[PDB]
Amino acid sequence: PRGSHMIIETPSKVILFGEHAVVYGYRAISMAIDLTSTIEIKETQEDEIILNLNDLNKSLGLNLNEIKNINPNNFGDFKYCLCAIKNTLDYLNIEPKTGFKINISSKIPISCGLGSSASITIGTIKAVSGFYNKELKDDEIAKLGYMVEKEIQGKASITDTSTITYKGILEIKNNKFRKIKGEFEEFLKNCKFLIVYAEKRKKKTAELVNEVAKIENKDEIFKEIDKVIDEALKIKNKEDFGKLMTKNHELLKKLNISTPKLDRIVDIGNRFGFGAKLTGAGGGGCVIILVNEEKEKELLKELNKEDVRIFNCRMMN
């Protein structure tokens, strides 16, 4: 495109199976998807970094001498991007000599388990490295993403940043990942999903994890969820994969991390799609639905009468 600025488009992420089990050493299976963020970076030669959150109509201006020394948690909505910048810069051992402006756009819903921040983070790390014509390998990128999440939050997990970085489908176990290709990835490439922001998650992940911590039956149901993953990996048709998703949902309910709203959306996903389940922690948030082409219009209609936001997406890569 004529005169284009540097622009990075990066994926969103969804956990298909093993949401709360991963915390205990079991497997999780996540996939990168079409809902993306876009980060544009260009020069301004005014000697200062300018951040622009177009979707929020917010802006931030910082001098070049302040970045390496800012504390990201002091800048609210700009913290991940700002942190991605500071971290990329000293990793590349660069001391900015010129200013730049960054514009951020995201189609990714916030706080419903999709990895809205990891995406801004990955796109930012890439934008900043590319802007200095010093592209990094997926190796260091995934690591810088991780370290950004760990700096902003007390701890972190590689899931978001690694799935978004390496894309496709990943098997996550103990903060280590195995990429999934072959026949399963192939199958997924033909699937069509619906991300449904059912309701505002009014509780933090730490809190949800605590509540899950206090279940007598937790470990027994985790095994079940893993038994489900075993089956999923060998899967071949949409009907079974669907039922397996529903099954994972029923199990997640058993950990009472679900809500009436989510469950109601899953029922609709079950009757008019092939299957469905909440995704991520469960203080509400969104549901993933496996679309049944033959009934898609019905699905969309029934969902429309519900107080929710709907997003079309497919595995990315």
Q: Which residues are catalytic?
A: 160
117 annotated ligand-binding residue: yes
CA separation for the pair 175, 156 (Å, rounded): 9
111 annotated ligand-binding residue: yes
105 annotated ligand-binding residue: no
- Please give the distance of CA 148 from its chain centroid, rounded to a whole number: 15
| Residues paired with residue 275 on neighbouring β-strands, in sequence order | 290
Q: Where are the beta strands (DSSP E) in the chain?
A: 6-17, 28-43, 48-53, 58-63, 100-106, 169-172, 177-180, 193-199, 275-278, 285-290, 309-313
Our CA dihedral for 83, 88, 91, 94, rounded to 10 degrees, sits at -110
CA separation for the pair 162, 264 (Å, rounded): 31
The token pair that represents 44 in the structure block: 């301004």
242 annotated ligand-binding residue: no
286 annotated ligand-binding residue: no
Environment class of residue 224 by beta-carbon count within 10 Å: exposed (0-12), middle (13-18) or buried (19+)?
A: middle
CA separation for the pair 20, 28 (Å, rounded): 8
110 annotated ligand-binding residue: yes
CA separation for the pair 113, 281 (Å, rounded): 7
109 annotated ligand-binding residue: yes
118 annotated ligand-binding residue: yes
114 annotated ligand-binding residue: yes
CA distances (Å), 209 to each of 157, 237, 283, in order?
Answer: 14, 33, 10
Closest among 232, 310, 294 to 31, alpha carbons compared: 232
CA separation for the pair 195, 56 (Å, rounded): 22
- Binding-site residues for ATP sit at 109-119
- Binding-site residues sit at 109-119
